[PDB]
Amino acid sequence: XXXXXXXXXXXXXXXXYQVLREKAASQRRDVERALTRFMAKTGETQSLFKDD
Amino acid sequence: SVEQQLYYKEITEACVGSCEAKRAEALQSIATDPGLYQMLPRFSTFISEGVRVNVVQNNLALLIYLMRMVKALMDNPTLYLEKYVHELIPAVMTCIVSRQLCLRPDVDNHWALRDFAARLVAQICKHFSTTTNNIQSRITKTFTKSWVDEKTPWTTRYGSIAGLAELGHDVIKTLILPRLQQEGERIRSVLDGPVLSNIDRIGADHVQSLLLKHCAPVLAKLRPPPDNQDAYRAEFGSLGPLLCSQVVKARAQAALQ
Amino acid sequence: XXXXXXXXXXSVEQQLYYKEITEACVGSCEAKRAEALQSIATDPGLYQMLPRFSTFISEGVRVNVVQNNLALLIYLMRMVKALMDNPTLYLEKYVHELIPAVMTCIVSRQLCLRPDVDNHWALRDFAARLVAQICKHFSTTTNNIQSRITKTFTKSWVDEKTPWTTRYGSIAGLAELGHDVIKTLILPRLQQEGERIRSVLDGPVLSNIDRIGADHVQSLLLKHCAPVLAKLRPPPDNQDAYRAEFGSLGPLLCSQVVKARAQAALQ
């Protein structure tokens, strides 16, 4: 079969349930902290310590 | 959800508005993002179509904004940029095109600043010629058909020379060396004849600047540094002896270590 | 608008065939080894289990250069040999992520064990032999092959205070380039490398790893360089020829000249 016949490649299952929703929720946390850092250094800023 | 387009909203609005600290802070934001993707498809799509807009609109400030945006996309050590690169590469190289349709004067040097963008090109290909090997062949054929022909404006020739320049060493050694002298004669025809195409005049002038002050070191390696006037004879006069003078400068820069 | 999911260049069948290729490249049974070697060298029209194959073959080369393991080295280098003789699969477009792995196999620090550097010299011999098989096909074009590898080994030979594995790999690669190559190169490097010999020999206080290494290296490259000047010079005046070759070649150069006269008498 290694020369004559052929096959088909789908190649991406990735269906690991808890791992999937870990990916999604971790990404949501990322976008949270990203926009936080952005408007953090963007707008009027007051701190918790001095100069953070 | 919501925060997707929230983040998208304010980072595009900072990408367009000229709040310069917020500008640079958005750039360092994108550069320092753990796990900013899935915004990436909409991101790049915006980049492509805003490029087309500002091609039609000829707003150089938005152009350097988008180029810094691409630079920031490049500098994530998380962003597997791969599958989307086919949108950036037009959006890159079309910025190395446009039909001289801004105002002239300073834009020439801003054309030079678009060569900054050409730096990005090499900073693409080093990470992305990993293909069923496609990318470098594609871009170099593109620059080749750019570089060879006539009916080729100074925007086109200038930026193509710039992109090959950013591709580096043996690109210049193999590809720019041959019709070096012929395009030097093209500029010599731009020289010494008519006067009032000063777009084209100063265009070819900082073309000469690109050629000399990028193409010196490969000849400094190859051609041994006697015979300045003969090197002018060996490389059509005009680059010499500033070819050899810049070669002396480059040998000094090498010996400075 | 979400596009249809992709499909690779492979089939599942031929990628499992590829996995057989790889694990036979691992293969301890030399029957499986030779089966793999013949399967490489005589599958024309394969062409599509090309570069991906060769690409992280070269990546495995880098990783095992780090791992410093001669068995993976000899397996990959005979693999590249069998790649070189499968005549349909043209090398040109896919050259430029392969040849540096060969030269990294040439250069240095193939150090599994210090008493076991012995096989690595033969590895370098085989490697430079492979480079010699490369160089007869590709330098018509852009001269990466001849000019870059020659100037590479040139400035590599110039590199003082480097381990002698570098020196051996350099001079062996220059040896494999040909008769007239060495005729150019080891014309001054005859007595200059003789100066290197008697810097090594009658040299240090004690470093017998480096002593025995560089000593057999100099001996190997001596009698391997010998057929050039044997074809060049007539075999008269061995006492003068040792003066013409800084002494240390004498009379091992003269013994090799006697061997060359014997090889001529075999004709």
Phi first, then psi: give them for residue C158, nearest 5 degrees: -70, -25
Query: CA-to-CA distance for B182 and B72, rounded, in angstroms?
Result: 39
Query: CA-to-CA distance for C44 and B98, rounded, in angstroms?
Result: 47
Task: Please report, to the nearest 10 degrees, the dihedral formed by the alpha carbons of residues C158, C160, C166, C172 taken in order.
Answer: 40
**List of chain A residues whose C-beta atoms are within 8 Å of the C-beta of residue C24:** none
C64 is written with which tokens? Answer: 């095992």
Q: Which of C27, C16, C118, C29 is nearest to C79 (CA)?
A: C27
Minimum CA–CA partner of B41 in chain C:
C2
Query: CA-to-CA distance for B47 and C121, rounded, in angstroms?
Result: 55
B159-162's contacts with Cβ under 8 Å and 24+ in sequence apart are B159/B96, B159/B97, B159/B111, B159/B114, B159/B115, B159/B118, B160/B96, B161/B207, B161/B210, B161/B211, B162/B96, B162/B112, B162/B114, B162/B115, B162/B118, B162/B210
| Inter-chain residue contact B3 with A38, CB threshold 8 Å | no
C20 touches A8 (CB < 8 A) = no
Query: CA-to-CA distance for B239 and A24, rounded, in angstroms?
Result: 59
Structure-solving method? cryo-EM
**List of chain A residues whose C-beta atoms are within 8 Å of the C-beta of residue B33:** 30, 34
**A with C: how many residue pairs have Cβ under 8 Å apart?**
32
| 3-class DSSP assignment, residue B7 | helix
B23 torsion bin: left (phi>0), alpha (psi -120 to 50), beta (else)? alpha
**List of chain A residues whose C-beta atoms are within 8 Å of the C-beta of residue B39:** 31
Question: Nearest Cβ partner of A31 from B3, B14, B25?
Answer: B3
Query: CA-to-CA distance for C229 and C264, rounded, in angstroms?
Result: 14
**List of chain C residues whose C-beta atoms are within 8 Å of the C-beta of residue A12:** 5-6
For residue B20, give how far its alpha carbon lies from the nearest alpha carbon of chain C (Å). Answer: 37
Q: Which of C173, C130, C178 is nearest to C152 (CA)?
A: C173
C152 touches C135 (CB < 8 A) = no
Query: CA-to-CA distance for B148 and B160, rounded, in angstroms?
Result: 10
Q: What angle do CA B37, B43, B46 make, to 5 degrees?
A: 170
User: What type of residue sits at position C180?
Assistant: D
| Inter-chain residue contact A26 with B11, CB threshold 8 Å | no
Query: CA-to-CA distance for B179 and A51, rounded, in angstroms?
Result: 59
**List of chain A residues whose C-beta atoms are within 8 Å of the C-beta of residue B38:** 27
Q: Which helix (H) or strand (E) holds B66?
A: helix B60-74
Residue with tokens 């004849």: B193
**Half-sphere exposure of residue B58, counting CA atoms within 13 Å on the CB side?**
10
Q: Which of B90, B139, B92 is nearest to B115 (CA)?
A: B92
User: What's the 3-state SS for B111-170?
Assistant: HHHHHHHHHHHHHHHHHHCCCCCCHHHHHHHHHHHHHHCCCCCHHHHHHHHHHHHHHCHH
Minimum CA–CA partner of C94 in chain B:
B133
Length of chain B: 257
Question: Nearest Cβ partner of C5 from A2, A5, A12?
Answer: A12
| Inter-chain residue contact A31 with B14, CB threshold 8 Å | no
B123 touches B61 (CB < 8 A) = no
